[PDB]
Amino acid sequence: IDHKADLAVAPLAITYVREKVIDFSKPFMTLGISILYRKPNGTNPGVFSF
Amino acid sequence: TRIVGGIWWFFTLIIISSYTANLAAFLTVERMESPIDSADDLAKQTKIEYGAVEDGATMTFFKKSKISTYDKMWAFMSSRRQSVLVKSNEEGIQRVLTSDYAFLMESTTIEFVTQRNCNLTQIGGLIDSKGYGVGTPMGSPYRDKITIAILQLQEEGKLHMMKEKWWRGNGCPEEESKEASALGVQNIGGIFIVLAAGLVLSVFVAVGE
Amino acid sequence: AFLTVERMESPIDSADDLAKQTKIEYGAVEDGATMTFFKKSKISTYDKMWA
Amino acid sequence: LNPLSPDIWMYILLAYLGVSCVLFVIARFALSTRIVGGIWWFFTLIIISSYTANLA
Amino acid sequence: FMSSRRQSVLVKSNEEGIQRVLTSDYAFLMESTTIEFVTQRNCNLTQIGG
Ligand SMILES: *[C@@H]1O[C@H](CO)[C@@H](O)[C@H](O)[C@H]1NC(C)=O
Ligand SMILES: *[C@@H]1O[C@H](CO)[C@@H](O)[C@H](O)[C@H]1NC(C)=O
Ligand SMILES: *[C@@H]1O[C@H](CO)[C@@H](O)[C@H](O)[C@H]1NC(C)=O
Incomplete structure (x- = not known):
């Protein structure tokens, strides 16, 4: 707000409102939100699977 | 001795029929259920927990989202x-x-975490529209200088190594990605072991006498 | 076929499993604060319940 | 052949060859033959059961 | 969604x-x-909707 720092190097998700208030530069990285879940767990019935 | 032979034949046939039917039922019910959740779709489930952090960037994106694949999720998590x-x-x-x-x-973040721990999985990706770059509060030329420097950085090959070394961590163990319907080695080895044991006992009792 | 029919349905039929299935009958007080939350507040399985 | 992996096919082939070899050894060298026939029949039963189940 | x-x-x-x-x-x-024109011209495509 005081323009103390002319730059802010960080992962800056350039949203429409953020671009409206801070005219951000071109995105160095193109990324997106992704889903997270637990790895599958294999409860095998053993060698005697039958 | 024809009646006993016939009844034994029908007995074996019906027992193996029941065995095949039950095993097939187990396989169909396990395969019909998706081993993973629907790709980037937690909808129609409402049982497995799902969401994000409170008032995070993802929360901002999906709070003002009216798509049925996302608005129902947003309403439930709110x-x-x-x-x-x-x-x-x-x-x-x-x-x-x-x-x-x-x-x-x-x-x-998700891939960094799953590299740091192989106990959690990742399914989809790029379900949100965003980009990461440096910031500039005003309409300055130095932001243009940084952007052109970045663009000339991608055109040459240096970004990949520096990008990956940050997220390398420990070596990721090799894990399957395109498994087919074929039975596992442990899934079939039991009958091999049983047959081998029966054969060796039969050979031993044959050579004993 | 008999075994698949009896097993594809959820014997534990927890919450959302009731929405997809229709063999089991279910209901409550008509608009007695039960489906008032279901007509509005669109949630996928809850929307199936309202339907 | 989708129900069985290539390694599963190799295991089935080696089991078949072992059964044939042990039968030949028994012939060249009745209760033991009865037990061998029964266990081989059961082996066929479970393997075909798994095959049917997976491809069904 | 498309927006x-x-x-x-x-x-x-x-x-x-x-x-x-x-x-x-x-x-x-x-x-x-145009959709059925393409399907007649090019295979592997069908108008899934009515
Ligand atoms: C994790 O393993 C446990 C075994 O206790 C199992 O009950 C659970 O379903 C597994 N979860 C996943 C996501 O694989
Ligand atoms: C997953 O967690 C269990 C205990 O919860 C641990 O023993 C195991 O090492 C973990 N796996 C990985 C890959 O860190
Ligand atoms: C079907 O076609 C799609 C599109 O070309 C392709 O991605 C997919 O691998 C194909 N699958 C099969 C089984 O041919």
Whole structure:
């Protein structure tokens, strides 16, 4: 707000409102939100699977 | 001795029929259920926990989202902020690790975490429109200088190594990605072991006498 | 076929499993604060319940 | 052949060859033959059961 | 949804949209007559909707 720092190097998700208030530069990285879940767990019935 | 032979024949036929039917039922019911959750779709489930952090960037994106694949999720997690919504990213990661929970931040964070721990999985990606870059409060030329420097940085090959070395961590163990319907080695080896044991006992009792 | 029919349905039929299935009958007080939350507040399985 | 992996096919082939070899050894060298026939029949039963189940 | 994902799969014409369909899990949205015209001309495509 005081323009103390002319730059802010960080992962800056350039949203429409953020671009409206801070005219951000071109995105160095193109990324997106992704889903997270637990790895599958294999409860095998053993060698005697039958 | 024809009647006893016939009844034994029908007995074996019906027993093997029941065995085949029950085994086939087990295989069909396990395969019909998707081993993973629907790709980038936690909808139509409302049982497995899902959400993101409280008032995070993902929360901002999906709060103002009216798509039925997303608006229902947003309404449910806003109704259940006390349970399905966490405060910090690591808290959500731990909640996923301890119990079935779906978590939703930037793909880079998710892949970094799953490299740091192979106990959690990733399914989809790029379900949100955003880009990462440097910031400039005003209409300055130095932001243009940084952008052109970045663009000339991609045109040459240096970004890949520096990008990956940050997210390398420990070596990721090799894990399957395109498994087919064929039975596993452990899934069939039991009958091999049983047949081998029967054969060796038969050979031993034959050579004993 | 008999075994698949009896097993594809959820014997534990927890919550959302009731929405997809229709063999089991279910209901409550008509608009007695039960489906008032279901007509509005669109949630996928809850929307199937309202339907 | 989708129900069986290539390694599963190799295991089935080696089991078949072992059964044939042990039958030949028994012939060249009745209760033991009865037990061998029964266990081989059961082996066929479970393997075909798994095959039917997976491809069904 | 398409506004939330604008220009993500917005092809400039069918002359690139058909290849976009044939190269990935991409579904097209066009007027009917052209759609069955393409299906008659090019196989592996059917108007799934009515
Ligand atoms: C994790 O393993 C446990 C075994 O206790 C199992 O009950 C659970 O379903 C597994 N979860 C996943 C996501 O694989
Ligand atoms: C997953 O967690 C269990 C205990 O919860 C631990 O023993 C195991 O090492 C973990 N796996 C990985 C890959 O860290
Ligand atoms: C079907 O076609 C799609 C699009 O070309 C392709 O991605 C997919 O691998 C194909 N699958 C089969 C089984 O041919």
